[PDB]
Amino acid sequence: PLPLTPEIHKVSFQLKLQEVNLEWTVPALTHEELNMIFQIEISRLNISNTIWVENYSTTVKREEAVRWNWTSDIPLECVKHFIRIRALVDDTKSLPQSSWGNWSSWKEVNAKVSVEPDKSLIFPKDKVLEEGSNVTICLMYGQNVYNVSCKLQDEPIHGEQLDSHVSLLKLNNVVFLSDTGTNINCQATKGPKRIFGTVLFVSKVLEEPKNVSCETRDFKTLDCSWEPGVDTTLTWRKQRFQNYTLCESFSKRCEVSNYRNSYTWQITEGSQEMYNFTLTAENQLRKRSVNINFNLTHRVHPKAPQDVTLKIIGATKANMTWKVHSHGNNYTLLCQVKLQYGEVIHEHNVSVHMSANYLFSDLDPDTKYKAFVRCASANHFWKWSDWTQKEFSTPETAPSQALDVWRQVWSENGRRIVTLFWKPLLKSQANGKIISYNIVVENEAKPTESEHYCVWAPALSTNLSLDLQPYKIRITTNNSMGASPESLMVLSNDSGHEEVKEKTIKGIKDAFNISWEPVSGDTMGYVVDWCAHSQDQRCDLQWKNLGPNTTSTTITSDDFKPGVRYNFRIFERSVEHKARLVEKQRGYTQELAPLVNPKVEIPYSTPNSFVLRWPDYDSDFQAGFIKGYLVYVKSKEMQCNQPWERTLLPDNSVLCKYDINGSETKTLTVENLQPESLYEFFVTPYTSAGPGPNETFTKVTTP
Amino acid sequence: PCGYIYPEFPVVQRGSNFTAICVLKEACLQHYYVNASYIVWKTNHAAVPREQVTVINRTTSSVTFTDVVLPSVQLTCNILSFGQIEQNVYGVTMLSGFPPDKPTNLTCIVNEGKNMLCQWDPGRETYLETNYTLKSEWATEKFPDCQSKHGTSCMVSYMPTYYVNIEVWVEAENALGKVSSESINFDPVDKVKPTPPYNLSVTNSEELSSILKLSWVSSGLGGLLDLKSDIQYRTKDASTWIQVPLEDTMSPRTSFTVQDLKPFTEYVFRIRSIKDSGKGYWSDWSEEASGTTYEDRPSRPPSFWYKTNPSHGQEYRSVRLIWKALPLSEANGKILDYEVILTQSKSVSQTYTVTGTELTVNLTNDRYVASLAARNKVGKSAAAVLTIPSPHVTAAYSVVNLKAFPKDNLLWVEWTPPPKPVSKYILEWCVLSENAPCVEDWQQEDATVNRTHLRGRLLESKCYQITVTPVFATGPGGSESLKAYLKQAAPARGPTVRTKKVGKNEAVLAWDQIPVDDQNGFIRNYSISYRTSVGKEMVVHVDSSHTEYTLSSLSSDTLYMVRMAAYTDEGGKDGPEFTFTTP
Amino acid sequence: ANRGCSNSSSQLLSQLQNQANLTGNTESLLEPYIRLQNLNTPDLRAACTQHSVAFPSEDTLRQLSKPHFLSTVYTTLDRVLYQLDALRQKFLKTPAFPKLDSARHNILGIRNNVFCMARLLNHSLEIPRSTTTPDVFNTKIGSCGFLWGYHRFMGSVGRVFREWDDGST
Ligand SMILES: *[C@@H]1O[C@H](CO)[C@@H](O[C@@H]2O[C@H](CO)[C@@H](O)[C@H](O)[C@H]2NC(C)=O)[C@H](O)[C@H]1NC(C)=O
Ligand SMILES: *[C@@H]1O[C@H](CO)[C@@H](O[C@@H]2O[C@H](CO)[C@@H](O)[C@H](O)[C@H]2NC(C)=O)[C@H](O)[C@H]1NC(C)=O
Ligand SMILES: *[C@@H]1O[C@H](CO)[C@@H](O[C@@H]2O[C@H](CO)[C@@H](O)[C@H](O)[C@H]2NC(C)=O)[C@H](O)[C@H]1NC(C)=O
Ligand SMILES: *[C@@H]1O[C@H](CO)[C@@H](O[C@@H]2O[C@H](CO)[C@@H](O)[C@H](O)[C@H]2NC(C)=O)[C@H](O)[C@H]1NC(C)=O
Ligand SMILES: *[C@@H]1O[C@H](CO)[C@@H](O[C@@H]2O[C@H](CO)[C@@H](O)[C@H](O)[C@H]2NC(C)=O)[C@H](O)[C@H]1NC(C)=O
Ligand SMILES: *[C@@H]1O[C@H](CO)[C@@H](O[C@@H]2O[C@H](CO)[C@@H](O)[C@H](O)[C@H]2NC(C)=O)[C@H](O)[C@H]1NC(C)=O
Ligand SMILES: *[C@@H]1O[C@H](CO)[C@@H](O[C@@H]2O[C@H](CO)[C@@H](O)[C@H](O)[C@H]2NC(C)=O)[C@H](O)[C@H]1NC(C)=O
Numbered sequence A: 001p002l003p004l005t006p007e008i009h010k011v012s013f014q015l016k017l018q019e020v021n022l023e024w025t026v027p028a029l030t031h032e033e034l035n036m037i038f039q040i041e042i043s044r045l046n047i048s049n050t051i052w053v054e055n056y057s058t059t060v061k062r063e064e065a066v067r068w069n070w071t072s073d074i075p076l077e078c079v080k081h082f083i084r085i086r087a088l089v090d091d092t093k094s095l096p097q098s099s100w101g102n103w104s105s106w107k108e109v110n111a112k113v114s115v116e117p118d119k120s121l122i123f124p125k126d127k128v129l130e131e132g133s134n135v136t137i138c139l140m141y142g143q144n145v146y147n148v149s150c151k152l153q154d155e156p157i158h159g160e161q162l163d164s165h166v167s168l169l170k171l172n173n174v175v176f177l178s179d180t181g182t183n184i185n186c187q188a189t190k191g192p193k194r195i196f197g198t199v200l201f202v203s204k205v206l207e208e209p210k211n212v213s214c215e216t217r218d219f220k221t222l223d224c225s226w227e228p229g230v231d232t233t234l235t236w237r238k239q240r241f242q243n244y245t246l247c248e249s250f251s252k253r254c255e256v257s258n259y260r261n262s263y264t265w266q267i268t269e270g271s272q273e274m275y276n277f278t279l280t281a282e283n284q285l286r287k288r289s290v291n292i293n294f295n296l297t298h299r300v301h302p303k304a305p306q307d308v309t310l311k312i313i314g315a316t317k318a319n320m321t322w323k324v325h326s327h328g329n330n331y332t333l334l335c336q337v338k339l340q341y342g343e344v345i346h347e348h349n350v351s352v353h354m355s356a357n358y359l360f361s362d363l364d365p366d367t368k369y370k371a372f373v374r375c376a377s378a379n380h381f382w383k384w385s386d387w388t389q390k391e392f393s394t395p396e397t398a399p400s401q402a403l404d405v406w407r408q409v410w411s412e413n414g415r416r417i418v419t420l421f422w423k424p425l426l427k428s429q430a431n432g433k434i435i436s437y438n439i440v441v442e443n444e445a446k447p448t449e450s451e452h453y454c455v456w457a458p459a460l461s462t463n464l465s466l467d468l469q470p471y472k473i474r475i476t477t478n479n480s481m482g483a484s485p486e487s488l489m490v491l492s493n494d495s496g497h498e499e500v501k502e503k504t505i506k507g508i509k510d511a512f513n514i515s516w517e518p519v520s521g522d523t524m525g526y527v528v529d530w531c532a533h534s535q536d537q538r539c540d541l542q543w544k545n546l547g548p549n550t551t552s553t554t555i556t557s558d559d560f561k562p563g564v565r566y567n568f569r570i571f572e573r574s575v576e577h578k579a580r581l582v583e584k585q586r587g588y589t590q591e592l593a594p595l596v597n598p599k600v601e602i603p604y605s606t607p608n609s610f611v612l613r614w615p616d617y618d619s620d621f622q623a624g625f626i627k628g629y630l631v632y633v634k635s636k637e638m639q640c641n642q643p644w645e646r647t648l649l650p651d652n653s654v655l656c657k658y659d660i661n662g663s664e665t666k667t668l669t670v671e672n673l674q675p676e677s678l679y680e681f682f683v684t685p686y687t688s689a690g691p692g693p694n695e696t697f698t699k700v701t702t703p
Numbered sequence B: 001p002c003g004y005i006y007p008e009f010p011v012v013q014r015g016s017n018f019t020a021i022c023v024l025k026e027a028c029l030q031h032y033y034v035n036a037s038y039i040v041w042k043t044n045h046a047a048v049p050r051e052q053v054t055v056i057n058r059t060t061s062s063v064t065f066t067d068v069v070l071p072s073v074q075l076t077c078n079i080l081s082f083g084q085i086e087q088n089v090y091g092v093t094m095l096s097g098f099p100p101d102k103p104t105n106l107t108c109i110v111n112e113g114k115n116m117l118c119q120w121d122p123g124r125e126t127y128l129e130t131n132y133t134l135k136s137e138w139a140t141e142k143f144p145d146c147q148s149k150h151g152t153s154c155m156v157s158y159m160p161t162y163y164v165n166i167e168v169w170v171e172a173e174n175a176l177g178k179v180s181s182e183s184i185n186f187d188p189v190d191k192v193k194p195t196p197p198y199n200l201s202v203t204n205s206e207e208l209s210s211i212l213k214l215s216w217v218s219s220g221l222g223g224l225l226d227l228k229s230d231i232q233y234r235t236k237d238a239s240t241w242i243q244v245p246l247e248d249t250m251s252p253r254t255s256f257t258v259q260d261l262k263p264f265t266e267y268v269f270r271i272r273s274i275k276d277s278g279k280g281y282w283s284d285w286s287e288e289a290s291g292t293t294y295e296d297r298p299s300r301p302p303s304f305w306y307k308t309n310p311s312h313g314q315e316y317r318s319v320r321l322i323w324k325a326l327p328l329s330e331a332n333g334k335i336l337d338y339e340v341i342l343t344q345s346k347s348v349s350q351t352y353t354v355t356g357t358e359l360t361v362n363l364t365n366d367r368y369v370a371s372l373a374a375r376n377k378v379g380k381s382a383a384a385v386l387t388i389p390s391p392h393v394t395a396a397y398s399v400v401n402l403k404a405f406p407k408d409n410l411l412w413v414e415w416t417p418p419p420k421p422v423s424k425y426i427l428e429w430c431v432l433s434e435n436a437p438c439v440e441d442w443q444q445e446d447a448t449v450n451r452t453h454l455r456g457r458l459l460e461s462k463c464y465q466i467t468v469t470p471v472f473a474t475g476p477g478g479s480e481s482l483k484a485y486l487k488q489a490a491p492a493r494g495p496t497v498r499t500k501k502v503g504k505n506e507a508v509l510a511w512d513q514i515p516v517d518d519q520n521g522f523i524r525n526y527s528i529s530y531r532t533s534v535g536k537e538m539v540v541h542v543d544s545s546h547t548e549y550t551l552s553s554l555s556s557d558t559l560y561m562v563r564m565a566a567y568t569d570e571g572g573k574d575g576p577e578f579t580f581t582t583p
Numbered sequence C: 001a002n003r004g005c006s007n008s009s010s011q012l013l014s015q016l017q018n019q020a021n022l023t024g025n026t027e028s029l030l031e032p033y034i035r036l037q038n039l040n041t042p043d044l045r046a047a048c049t050q051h052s053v054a055f056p057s058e059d060t061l062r063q064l065s066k067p068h069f070l071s072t073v074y075t076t077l078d079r080v081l082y083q084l085d086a087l088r089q090k091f092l093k094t095p096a097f098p099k100l101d102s103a104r105h106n107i108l109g110i111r112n113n114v115f116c117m118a119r120l121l122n123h124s125l126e127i128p129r130s131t132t133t134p135d136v137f138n139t140k141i142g143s144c145g146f147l148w149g150y151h152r153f154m155g156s157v158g159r160v161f162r163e164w165d166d167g168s169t
């Protein structure tokens, strides 16, 4: 057999990592390259204590030196070892007799440095471990030292004596105490009384970055972020750095980041749309890595728009100009315009490339508007940008609706005095603040000589002095912009005293049944007006415009109160805008009892009868139409002859009632009286609601 | 271009001269063929006069300005090419401002837990960019500079070190000069403004009700500064604050005992601290802490009185013991119950316990000796004695000179003390009404008082029957009934006038009295008015003591209408009308 | 130079006494360092108290005159500053231990005060390395002993200042 006996050439040590580097060659090789198996046997404290057996198969060539390493748990400076290796060939194609060769010489592996008789050593010193691992600490004392007892912070430690002058300490599942390390103090009982020991550094476990995501803002920087996890940095010079490496594949670019949970990436030009990153966190113990994959165009977060400017091209139209930052013609932004005013919100959708506008329409004048614009990606939406607010006020415009006019004429000083009344315009009907009103009065006999009058706001009444000639008036509103459509009205030769029929109507509590009979077949509409007929007030002429196809309309007003008469006057407007008086009406909203009784006076007195009379009442300043009079006579012996109603009184008297049918007659004579007697009476009118107030009895004496 | 303008940044103080140049290069000189003679200087797009424009060389021209007032002067040198075409060469802006002044009012304050803050006043407006830098250094070391970011205050960046003198000063620099203020040498420990003390607690004392011990904690930078405090206290209804003498709170302490306080009254406290040496700055006021004093024994016994109803023919008499509660100023706490003790000078004491204000017991005809005293949480009150004499004793001493008059809306009543030693005076009053009985109201006064007002809710235009009864050592004195008014008014309705008899030329007139609820004052006279249908008005006046009055000067066969009105001190009121026939 | 340390002497003496009383306290620098390095075991405290740096005793400071005492205080404070700078350059963690900066500023202030006091007496003061550490336990013990000796020296200097204020010859 071929004596393939390996020969150990050089052996080395590494006390920092507890490794034994071993090199050996075999001179008994004949071919160029063959596969071999090296069975390795390790001993401790003598060549008969086998503690480890391993098989190392590796192809070896001619003159090539074989290198192998082994790790020992206990420190090498405490005990020696012995190693021997033999070879074996795996020749399954020729000579199928795998026989082991002779064992090599026991190469002494010695690393015991020294020991002083009055000192002691401990290994290892300042060991860095992971939370939850094991460790074996060896201690070597001198010859004079005796009864060595090691302890943790505060607890005993049961050490094992490996030899006569060494001792082994075993620690299981060490826990994290502090970032400054756990002190292991060991004091000797006998001999030199002192304290010696080392610090055991325990570190935490490195975690994986969680929720790693990145983003783009302006196609130039990528602000990628992640979670760092738990800090695993010690305080002494053992472990200081915890680096985070983000290294892309398609570009092969990566450097140590200066931050812990953020980094600003710089992209090179080339319009490359692809990304495949690999974030790596590494410390002195382990190395974690996480891979992400995304697209550049699918994670775009547009910023707030710039170059925002607004222009007014009218009271109902306005443009909205803005500009954004785009990199490439294919990337188009899907923005959202928001027009808000008061409580109404108007929103739409717009698509832009680099800069576009949105023509607004149907805007209300004298109204402040607020524009809100934000943009986002069109196809692959990621996030919405910030809102951009811009306020502006639309200008004013001349009115567009006609102002309704009405007049009231009478005879005074021989001239036709006319008073023009007009109602204030609404907000949306004026389209601005009313400054003044233009009054253009044109005469038909002299169209060249026209008078111009200006009534300033908020005056709603004016007086003009004209003759019996027919005039044509023109009224319009003037604001800071222009003029409003004028209303056409003309005067006629009528004095306003046309004798028409008077009709009395019974009004409703909040309405009136006004009915007028048409007199012409060619008309444009009717106008009605009424005045509160009272004693010491000036009536407010209220009117309304009606069409030519109506005959009866119910008016509504909150100023109508029971007790006052309203004289309605119906005016018909012909095709020439001429108003003619056709019908007069009057009525009460709710007829009430009379408030004042007429003064009675006796014209004649006879021993058997007496006559009564009172002046005419005011049928215009009353609370209701008087239908007649109710008198109540009082006596001691007279009887109530028909048709007088008799009513008894608890005072042993007589009371006769007379309903005077008709409000015209004011004289009545009662008979069946006796002379040298006493008589009492009182007069009062009555309405449809009831009689007037009960007054005192008039004192009269019959001779 | 053709060149530049020297100086590029002209900054001249207001009230001085100025001269600028505008050099033209040879390139544009040969290109445009426009020398330094066709230059037209423009200041804010305005043509300058030719008197101040002077040329020195072929490629340099100069202009002068005397006492410029305009702050922003845009100086532009422009040449005139062929065809009257103006072309711009260069343009600069000239500023006008005066240099700053020496800063003053250099003071620094060190807040507790913050860095040192210094402030100063700038003075006048320089109309130019001016930076203020605060310097600071020890005797052997220098500190970083405090550059004012805005305004005049600047907060240093280093931590203050105590017991080491530091010298600071501020330098004002602008585009026209640099001037530094005066330096101050101080100790950072003498400029500390401490934080207001917190956790202020007010505790009472069960033994001494007139004291209130205070308890608070102070920061003191961890026990480094001995801080003296200032304590202010006040009630809950008053707005002014009473300050304790500052000499009593000079020693460093965390507790103080305020004395001379009212029993059973709440108080509010606040405190602020400052260094013992009197230096530094007073801290802000602390949070207001509330505290209620402990109760104490009441001082004055409550008022006591008794009333006996007439019960003739029985051995036992019914007596109603009445008494009022003590106010919160004299009770010094919450009254629990009232104890009564009765004994006829020879028998045992009969004790009762009534939590109300009244008590009715049946006693016999002999003399009794009662005793009442309010009981509190800590003790009882004084024993007020009020005996009950036998029903067969007649009062021999009564009060004289009784008079009452309303003054300042108060019905004051005065009286003269009897010639015998009295113990106390009792006043009783109630409204006078013929439709319903009056409620019993009373009040107790000492023996020294001879004139006082009625303490109660009185009503105007109402008659109050006032009764005064003196109390002796052996029993009550006399009882007299008087009438008075607080605010008289006109009666509501006039008296009903009736005719008792009618004659040929004479007729008497009668009337009924005005009720007490209708008088609304003391009646003084009565006015009788009468007139016929065509006669004149004749008014006669009769006193209130008269009821019947004969009317003279009466004509026969004449109808007469009478009207009678009752006039009081506050006017009068007409009565109803009546008409009688004279046969 | 003349921009500080005014001619007042009693205020300077009071400031020196207050600074000495404030610095001579084990709760200032020693106790936080002991509680930070996990040295709360009684055996560790005994090892701390055993190894002590040779500092000038109280009798030696009391026997010397005033200028010699000021010069010795100056030199000892300089050595303490150097040792604290070495400990700072060896620990490699500033944010977890500000008591070092506080004590450094206090020592600088005491040095300034003693220099001004020496200048007021018309006396001229006397005017004059591996970052890595093989072991950590020995370094901890040495730093502990140095801090203990420094606190004892500060207490002795405070007592000498109190004796000087009592004398005031
Ligand atoms: C020599 O090698 C043998 C083989 O392992 C070992 O002898 C052991 O010695 C210990 C010491 O008392 C005994 O308890 C064991 O029973 C022995 N045998 C074994 C298999 O462990 C030891 O490694 C070496 N001898 C000595 C004395 O250390
Ligand atoms: C530290 O030492 C312990 C105890 O000696 C060992 O725990 C062993 O873990 C393995 C794997 O789970 C088990 O199969 C064994 O039964 C455990 N006990 C022993 C005695 O081997 C192991 O060497 C270390 N444990 C850890 C968690 O690292
Ligand atoms: C972690 O980052 C640090 C800091 O960037 C680097 O540490 C360097 O390590 C090398 C090799 O030991 C030294 O030559 C350098 O002086 C160290 N500093 C620098 C700034 O390069 C290194 O990138 C990482 N270190 C470890 C231990 O992972
Ligand atoms: C994208 O990045 C990942 C992670 O950085 C890499 O994927 C590697 O692809 C190769 C080729 O198939 C494999 O051998 C590796 O095992 C993969 N993982 C790693 C961690 O290297 C690679 O850089 C990119 N992958 C692709 C498919 O492009
Ligand atoms: C990532 O974005 C790029 C460009 O924005 C696109 O990649 C395309 O992927 C498809 C699928 O293989 C190819 O056919 C195209 O040629 C690629 N380029 C373009 C411009 O379309 C795609 O939008 C995203 N990639 C993937 C794999 O979805
Ligand atoms: C707002 O609406 C019109 C309609 O688009 C805007 O028209 C733009 O005018 C500018 C100036 O000539 C052109 O460069 C643009 O191409 C036009 N279109 C757009 C979409 O911007 C105009 O800005 C506004 N109207 C007025 C009257 O100014
Ligand atoms: C330099 O400026 C002067 C203006 O002072 C000009 O010189 C004149 O040039 C003309 C023709 O070349 C002569 O006729 C004049 O006599 C010169 N002097 C004056 C005072 O007019 C001209 O603008 C510049 N000089 C040159 C040579 O171009």
Ligand SMILES: *[C@@H]1O[C@H](CO)[C@@H](O[C@@H]2O[C@H](CO)[C@@H](O)[C@H](O)[C@H]2NC(C)=O)[C@H](O)[C@H]1NC(C)=O
Pocket: B056, B057, B058, B059, B060
């Ligand atoms: C004419 O006067 C101007 C200024 O009035 C001077 O121009 C100077 O020319 C020298 C020569 O190079 C430069 O160094 C200076 O900077 C120029 N300016 C000044 C203010 O001295 C000079 O005296 C004359 N210029 C020429 C071209 O002869």
Ligand SMILES: *[C@@H]1O[C@H](CO)[C@@H](O[C@@H]2O[C@H](CO)[C@@H](O)[C@H](O)[C@H]2NC(C)=O)[C@H](O)[C@H]1NC(C)=O
Pocket: B016, B017, B064, B065, B066, B067
């Ligand atoms: C410098 O400023 C002074 C102002 O104090 C001026 O000097 C005189 O100013 C008066 C009034 O403007 C002129 O009439 C004189 O001709 C100036 N010169 C002299 C010598 O009196 C002037 O603004 C500047 N002085 C010069 C010489 O330019």
Ligand SMILES: *[C@@H]1O[C@H](CO)[C@@H](O[C@@H]2O[C@H](CO)[C@@H](O)[C@H](O)[C@H]2NC(C)=O)[C@H](O)[C@H]1NC(C)=O
Pocket: B104, B105, B107, B119, B120, B121
């Ligand atoms: C100097 O100016 C300072 C302004 O900093 C003033 O001194 C105090 O300033 C504070 C805040 O400005 C005020 O609340 C005080 O009322 C000021 N007076 C005092 C006595 O504190 C003051 O204008 C000037 N101080 C002196 C002493 O003149």
Ligand SMILES: *[C@@H]1O[C@H](CO)[C@@H](O[C@@H]2O[C@H](CO)[C@@H](O)[C@H](O)[C@H]2NC(C)=O)[C@H](O)[C@H]1NC(C)=O
Pocket: B524, B525, B526, B541, B567, B568, B569, B570, B571, B572
């Ligand atoms: C009757 O009494 C009334 C009121 O009591 C008297 O009317 C008042 O008389 C005093 C003068 O004595 C004046 O204040 C006024 O003349 C009256 N004041 C009021 C408020 O009425 C009346 O004078 C008495 N009649 C007689 C005859 O003495």
Ligand SMILES: *[C@@H]1O[C@H](CO)[C@@H](O)[C@H](O)[C@H]1NC(C)=O
Pocket: A021, A067, A068, A069
């Ligand atoms: C043994 O260690 C050496 C140097 O450290 C090197 O060749 C390699 O890491 C190991 N070799 C083998 C074959 O395992």
Ligand SMILES: *[C@@H]1O[C@H](CO)[C@@H](O)[C@H](O)[C@H]1NC(C)=O
Pocket: A100, A101, A102
């Ligand atoms: C080597 O091994 C062979 C057979 O395996 C045998 O001669 C003997 O055991 C060894 N020879 C020598 C010389 O040691």
Ligand SMILES: *[C@@H]1O[C@H](CO)[C@@H](O)[C@H](O)[C@H]1NC(C)=O
Pocket: A210, A211, A227
């Ligand atoms: C996403 O990241 C955030 C960190 O801000 C956190 O909610 C978490 O780590 C991630 N989400 C999930 C569901 O893990």
Ligand SMILES: *[C@@H]1O[C@H](CO)[C@@H](O)[C@H](O)[C@H]1NC(C)=O
Pocket: A347, A348, A349
């Ligand atoms: C814009 O389009 C989206 C989706 O197509 C939809 O919400 C709506 O049609 C528009 N947005 C609004 C706010 O009207």
Ligand SMILES: *[C@@H]1O[C@H](CO)[C@@H](O)[C@H](O)[C@H]1NC(C)=O
Pocket: B129, B130, B131, B173, B174, B175
């Ligand atoms: C003053 O500070 C500003 C910065 O705030 C600096 O630009 C300027 O140069 C400084 N000096 C002057 C004279 O303005």
Ligand SMILES: *[C@@H]1O[C@H](CO)[C@@H](O)[C@H](O)[C@H]1NC(C)=O
Pocket: B199, B217
């Ligand atoms: C002060 O009171 C608060 C709660 O009222 C509580 O922190 C503690 O009781 C007190 N704090 C101190 C530092 O004494």
Ligand SMILES: *[C@@H]1O[C@H](CO)[C@@H](O)[C@H](O)[C@H]1NC(C)=O
Pocket: B316, B318, B362
């Ligand atoms: C008190 O005693 C008398 C004895 O006759 C009797 O009226 C009653 O028991 C008591 N009085 C009252 C009012 O109850």
